Amino acid sequence: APVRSLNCTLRDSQQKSLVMSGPYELKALHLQGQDMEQQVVFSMSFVQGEESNDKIPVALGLKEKNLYLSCVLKDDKPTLQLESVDPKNYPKKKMEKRFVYNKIEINNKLEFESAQFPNWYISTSQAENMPVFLGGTKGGQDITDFTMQFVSS
Template identity: 35%
Template sequence: MEITRKVVSGYSFGKTVLHVVAVQKLRKGISYCPRRFQDTDVQNLLNDIFVQEEEILTSTKAFVAPKYKLLGTKECTMRDRQNKCMTLHQNPEGAQLVAIYLNGVNIQREEKISMSFYTARNLDISEKRPVALGLGGKNLYLACSLEDSEPQLQLENIQIPTHEPRVLTHDRRVPTHERRALKWVEQSINNISGVKDEELPRFLFLKSENVSTSSFESAAYPGWYISTSQAENSLVGVKPQVDQKYIREFLVLP
């Protein structure tokens, strides 16, 4: 609720009538006035009649519910239909997600996926569930953005500065146990829960299930799905549903 105070002039049609009355009184007063009528006399008379009024305007701002609500997060692994694993590759262009076959000790290279589940009141999703997909233990999330007039999948680093007061945890004057307890305030919010509603759609994918596999459609670009190539050691990207050369069915494993 917002209350606004506004001072408005007292001059109105009703006050104009009073003005006429005041003039009549003024005329009568002149004949009986023992001294010359001064400008201040007129001002005092008008001040007695015209009084500034304070008008209180009340405007109500309705509460707007958020478009998206985070329900919870679980950790899993994702492999495409051919059992290729998701791995993280760092290169000069940045972090990239690559699908390759892993076995034996190499399986340790497989990335855990942090899958965050949402409700959305502005999406026509029927049986689909909005999810955000991040790399477990990292602040990297899959995001779909438009580049060269075509949606592209990328790993985006989420870092949202907190407004908490910073604590110098290396300060030796602070006891060790307190430095540990206060260390968290130096961190940024590095997960999807800190992303604002208007920025969230590019991170959301509509998860639909078909027997043993799942597909992930971009919420920002309907008809475009997270996909892998038939070939090994290829980037994970987004492709249109009509492009059958790519794999868009994934196994979601605990």
């Protein structure tokens, strides 16, 4: 397909699942059992960009929803946000830079670095029920690695 994609869920290294907070926000919390179905399912698209054997550019949209994770400057600081897009023009092989992430395979974990803002990563807090955000520090208090689970689509 023009732009190839696959459906998946992500869990941070502390086994927290991701769920929709408001219409434009994601939160992370320890979920289990029935509640597991509340978790967000992503449509990860493999877009154009500088590629490596361990660094692959991707776009992260919500499955069946014209909403994509985007990195933009908000108050002079890199910020993560869910952005609405024209449902007929997305996804596409050549996504605007703010939608692109460098999927990095480390341990057996994944890290998502903003293509727009070097060394800024999708991160979660140690705390329960806090927003998913863009962090500029690795190996610290905040969590920056995840594992991915494939879903039947």
